[PDB]
Amino acid sequence: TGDRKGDLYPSSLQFYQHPPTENISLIEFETFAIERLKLLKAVENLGVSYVKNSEEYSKKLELELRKLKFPYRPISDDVYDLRRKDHISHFILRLAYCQSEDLRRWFIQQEMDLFKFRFGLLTKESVQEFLKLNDLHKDIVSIVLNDFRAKLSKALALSARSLPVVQSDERLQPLLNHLSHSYIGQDFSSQSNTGKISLEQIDGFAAKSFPLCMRQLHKSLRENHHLRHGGRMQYGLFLKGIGLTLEQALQFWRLEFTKGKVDSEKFDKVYAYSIRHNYGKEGKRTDYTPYSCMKVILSNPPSQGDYHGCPFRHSDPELLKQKLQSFKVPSSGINQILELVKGMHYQLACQKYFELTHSVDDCGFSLNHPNQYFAESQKLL
Amino acid sequence: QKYGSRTNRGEVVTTYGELQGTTWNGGSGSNTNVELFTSLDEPLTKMYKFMFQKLMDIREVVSIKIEELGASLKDHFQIDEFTSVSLPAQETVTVLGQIGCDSNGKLNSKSVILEGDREHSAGMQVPVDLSELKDYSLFPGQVVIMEGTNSTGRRFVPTKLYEGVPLPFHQPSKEFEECPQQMVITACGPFTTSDTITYDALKDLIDIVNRDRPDICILLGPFLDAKHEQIENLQLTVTFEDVFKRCLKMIIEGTRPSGCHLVIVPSLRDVHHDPVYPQPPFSCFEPAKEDKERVHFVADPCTLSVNGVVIGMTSTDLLFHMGAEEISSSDRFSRILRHILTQRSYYPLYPPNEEINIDYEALYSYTPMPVTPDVFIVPSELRYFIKDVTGCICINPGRLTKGLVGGTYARFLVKSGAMRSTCISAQVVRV
Amino acid sequence: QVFRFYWLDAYEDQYSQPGVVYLFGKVWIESADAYVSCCVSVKNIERTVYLLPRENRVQLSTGKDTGAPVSMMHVYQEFNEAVAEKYKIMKFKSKKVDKDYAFEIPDVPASSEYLEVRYSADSPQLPQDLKGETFSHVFGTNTSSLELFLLSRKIKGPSWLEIKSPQLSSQPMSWCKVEAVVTRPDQVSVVKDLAPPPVVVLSLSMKTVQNAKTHQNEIVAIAALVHHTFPLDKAPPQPPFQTHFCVLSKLNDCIFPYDYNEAVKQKNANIEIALTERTLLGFFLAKIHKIDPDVIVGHDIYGFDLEVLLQRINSCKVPFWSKIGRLRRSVMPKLGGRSGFAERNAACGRIICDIEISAKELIRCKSYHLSELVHQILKAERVVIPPENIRNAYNDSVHLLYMLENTWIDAKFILQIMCELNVLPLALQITNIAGNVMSRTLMGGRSERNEYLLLHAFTENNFIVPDKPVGLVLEPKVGFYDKFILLLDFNSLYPSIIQEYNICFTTVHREIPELPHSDLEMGILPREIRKLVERRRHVKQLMKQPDLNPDLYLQYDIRQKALKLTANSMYGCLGFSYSRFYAKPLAALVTHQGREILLHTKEMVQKMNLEVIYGDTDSIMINTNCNNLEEVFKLGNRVKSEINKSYKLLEIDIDGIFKSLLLLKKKKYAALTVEPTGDGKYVTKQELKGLDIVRRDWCELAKQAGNYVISQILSDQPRDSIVENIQKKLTEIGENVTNGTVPITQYEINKALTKDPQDYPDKKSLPHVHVALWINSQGGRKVKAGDTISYVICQDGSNLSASQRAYAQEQLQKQENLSIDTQYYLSQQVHPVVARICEPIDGIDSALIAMWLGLDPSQFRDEENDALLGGPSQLTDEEKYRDCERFKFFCPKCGTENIYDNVFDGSGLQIEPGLKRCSKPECDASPLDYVIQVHNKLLLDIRRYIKKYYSGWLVCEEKTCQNRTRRLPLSFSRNGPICQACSKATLRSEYPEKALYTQLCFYRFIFDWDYALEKVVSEQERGHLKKKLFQESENQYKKLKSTVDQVLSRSGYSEVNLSKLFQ
């Protein structure tokens, strides 16, 4: 209790009943929103991958909570800060996750999971403290959760009823209207130190380091000696992300197109500018930024004759299975992947593929960007 | 050099009212009660967060301004119904709106447009044809009611322009019936010569204050002018706040012998203060315990009550801003002052001049004139004057310094309930 | 005696004659074997009022319940003693009734017993807020006589009515052939199942001229086309008219041509020559009286024709103005005021059909001016005689006859548009379904149409009707789509929501109210909507029957259209504030449910691998991503099925298909509309919406470039071929311009002078004004307003803006020092016209187009995608501050500019704070010594940026307008202020709040020691900078950052009030 603290945050766990009343900064608002979105997405991924009672689930969830600095263990100023984070972020996400029933459900599920986890970490004393502060062994959590869920649903309804007051705040519209579709990985626009890649290496990379989304495009570029706009962008930007320099890319594409229905002059007049912009820092931020998994999955769905997109999403399941068979991946693994695809856990499916191809049970990272994929592959060499 | 050797020191350049002796004396603020005019609306006394204006909020503020003034005028004139400005009108209809210019230049008789409010016109505009109006005086942002016809649906032709209606004067309470006449000395910045930062004119004015012992001294900004040649070219060796603190200390400490209530009004040209209108009061100076009751840091604009006499004051150069845009069919300053009084705002010009930053929510909350002031202090780059506009004594004391040469100040005597002659006498005098 | 007549219109004058309503219609006369107009006066319509008893008697003086149970005898006694005598009510009939109430007045039970008092209309009117000790509220005080009559006798729209014991009027009250009076409203009964009679339709057009002196419009010609037997249930006749008349007048000292009479006679037409406007108006009134049209159809008749007619009648002092209507009126109606031009009832008893309103209701068009309607509905061309030519037509008889024939052709076009749209049968069906007056059906706007449906429904179910008062958008995904595009009509969204969720005045408690429980039975409003939907379904099923009479097919089609229109318009009763049934809670609930449905539909379509490129409560635009039409239809059926699964009552239809679509905005696109001809083969037609350029000062070069770009986009080619062709043409045009192979006539820019050139406030920035001033200075024909100035921007070696370098073509050919400014003609004429169509294409930007044209791209350089790539909150510092000005400080010693963009400068052990050493190697001055000057410059820069923000400069988002103004107009669209130069695009802030916030954040960033050490600086550099020898610099940087922190603390953009968000 240094300067401006109080008894507003007695216990770690809370039912999130009283909205915050403070005046925070826009930077704090955005940071809290994104951090809790990362936490909830991690919760969802771990729930899909592992059994919620498993020790792996607990270890990974504790690691994520420590990384994002959220309350997980049972009043020092720092502790107070964390709790405040939790309290504000939650409501921010409420504002983000009340527009559509689907979203609401998703939010609720994740929240419940988190709450359960936290309850599992409460010592009996602390547990009783909680049960007192809110005017309330293995089975008790269930009842608590039931109550929580009731409350939360009600709250979300109320939030959906109070949406018009928030839409007028342009500052918060881009975030809240699109938080569910917000990329939460690392940045690849600024290469900084991406290493030096020779063109001769690229083919070899496509064997094992390129994720399927890029691999397919590579194959097309080496078969038809041409890619359509979508693909041109996707793949080229990926190449930028893996370290190809502008000159290098100009050579690459040049040769490829020159191998069919294109001469040098044409490449200079029609296509070169594209690549140049891909390597520039002016545009709409979709021209020089390597595309993320979500960008590839939820935007620009390929049409017939278009070889871009996410294979785990935009390819017919049966076809995908055939493709995996062509890669000689063990049948059981294929089944796993397909199951994940049926759950719309496309990124996770890709992750499983990675784990199989590199023969590592645990990859040690969460897949959210093709370039990340590549980098991890190279780290495993 | 030029200022120090001037020969017209103390010359009375303008006079109004009862003739007084060659020397003026005051009560040293003994039987004086100075406060902010207690109206329905709360006054601006502290900084308000700014730099965040939504276009919707500006639209709402402008529309409600038009609507409120039009409602008052409709009740006063017993007008039956207002009609949408944009709709065609074969017969004569009464329309409420605000004047504007169809382009970015200065308004002229062939570039006038009337924009209606959201309630009666959905915010639609219409060109105006002033061929059938025999007499008019229009400036942008002026809320007007006109009788006219729109036969083509594309050009409104006014035939009558309703006159403005000023607010009623203040009815003072008897609490100040026995108080004596109060002396007020008002001066406006800049207070230092163009090529100096020593505040010689301010020292002369402080000497005048201590000599005459006025009851109130109204000092209007700027106190550290942003257009001062030294300030713009970055030749100052001390921070702006330090120069302003030195100036305020000089003013307050130097006026200690006079015991005179000081009313400090900020200016948009104050390089050290927040550049927004309505301007909040200065808050970077804490007067000593012996001067707290004497110094009044007020906002721009300010409505002051002095023993029941209501004095309106603004540092903004309203006459210069509106003189550049007012168009008339055939005294121009008197017309502009009457426009200000009838619009009931300390800044009715829309869009504003290029030199003023307007926060429109604060403008809506704080610019409205509570009543018609007994005295209206309006410093201007234009020539000094003392005019009687609809019973209000509008005083332009000029500026204390005019470039390299000394300027002028004003002194007037106010008593509540005198004779309506609340202003006994007034004089624009040289420094 | 029984009087059978088919009624069409009704008129009520509450102020003049209380309790009397006039009904106008058709009566069959055997002596003439024809239908004639008749007016029936229904008098003695009693005021009906309902007094609501209290639970316990209340002393009005004290307002405290007395605890005495109040029977209805107490209410009767109080009314007879206190209310009756206090308001001069002599005779009345009281009764006990049971009524329901579920509307917006607090403390009225859902069902209760009321005291119904009926008393004559000549007695005074009780106050609306009347209250007594025994009764709490009074309902129906201001109910109109016509409403009481229609609801009492169950009269639903035009129909055959039988009158028992009709009387004869003492004196004529109408301009109708037959008159009758009924003493009691109960004598009028509704006959059923009989066919409507034919009606007389008169299509009216008139030519007027504006008087520059009197500022009034003088009617100079009138043409009328009359059909005496017009069907309301059959197909429109061919030809649409039988007779016609025309009247022509001289324009007040504009004498007729010498042989006007001979030419008119030779024309062998029904043309009447009037020597004055007064005679013309008298002739017109006489003809309207004699013909006696049941329907008068015109274009802008309510807003222009009728108003001008009345003004010219009262200006020329023409008697018997009321002959325009059917009732004998002495005083002209009050001006429109708030109600509007239509709700003035100038032609009382005649149905006035304005094809503008009817077209706006029944057909979509780019504009609703008569020429556009003629082009779109009749596929014809309409000739507009310029105003300056109408008065010049009085020089030759041929020109005058041409003007009169133009008026006749306009009347013919109006009648043809009315017949083609089937406005009258549709109006009849809508009136019958709703049960209102047909005149108000054809008036449109705020006139009562569906309020009457609800009134009938509630009255039939023992309700006390209220007294008369006295949407998420999925923003367009701008871009080019070479795949088929599906348009789905969601107009049935709100009625479907009302049905499915049982939203009603009786099922929802009145913050958005919670949905009614499923246990509740269907409400009245959902029941009415269900009845309409089921009726339309039944009519459609009957239509599906093969081998059916075409006449019955047309009847069923009209009925189905009317049912759909009524069902879709039902929501307005709850939503519109002016609505008689306005219920803010119900409208809010319906809107919220609509939002939910729209978002869920977007999610479904996305899950189907398709793209929703636009969405509004009325429509959904989806990207099918298919090259086959059969697959497009399959996907449409699949989308309909998926939607219907989650919402059974939401029935969707395909409104159109586009093969290609360049979309910039709803109402702003180019497309290839697909009309399928059956068997998998279709025809494509170009459709450009909202691509017209308001500004007409464009050189032919730019116009041709834009036309070619649109032609390339609207070709069936893939994206790559289109882009290649566009690049080819742009490079060709640039090379031609730079090679001087372009004809000079194509560089000419024509602009109209709307004022005297000296009267333009912005004359300096206007080139056509410059040229006009030059022309006037020369000494030839002076150029006044209305003149067209032609100019070419030429380079003359003057270092003056393009506006000043504007020259007439002859001057360019003569001077020999003048050359065409090719750079201007490529950057300011071709580039905007081309980029407004090419920028939406992904991969093409303004810089690329400039490069192709041969210019310098340096001079020309979606929230969903930003989120997909990180969002606005996860940007790097370089990208976050790339548009911010860097801190410029001039060294006091050497005077060289120092640009600061980071806290630290250099790499490795050579890294030091930026303000430690001057940028000039020969300069040893340390800016850290002059930190007072740095502070002052920082404050001045902050003042400069705040001034820039508060300048409030707005620029039009349209490339072809780019209007720059300081004035914010009160006229707003859904997107923001509407630009007053073009009236079709939004004004955007030149320096938005985000720009100022980011600038201040950047100035804080360039002085943030701690942040730079953690993020920007490396490890070895951090170690080298985290020692002594920099503590003083650290302190000075902290002090400098304190200034920007102080400024930002006073900014509202940097603070979020969580109290306002969560409540």
Ligand code: SF4
């Ligand atoms: S999950 Fe990401 S990396 Fe894997 S195939 Fe899809 S887009 Fe590529």
Ligand SMILES: [Zn+2]
């Ligand atoms: Zn230097």
Ligand SMILES: [Zn+2]
């Ligand atoms: Zn515009």
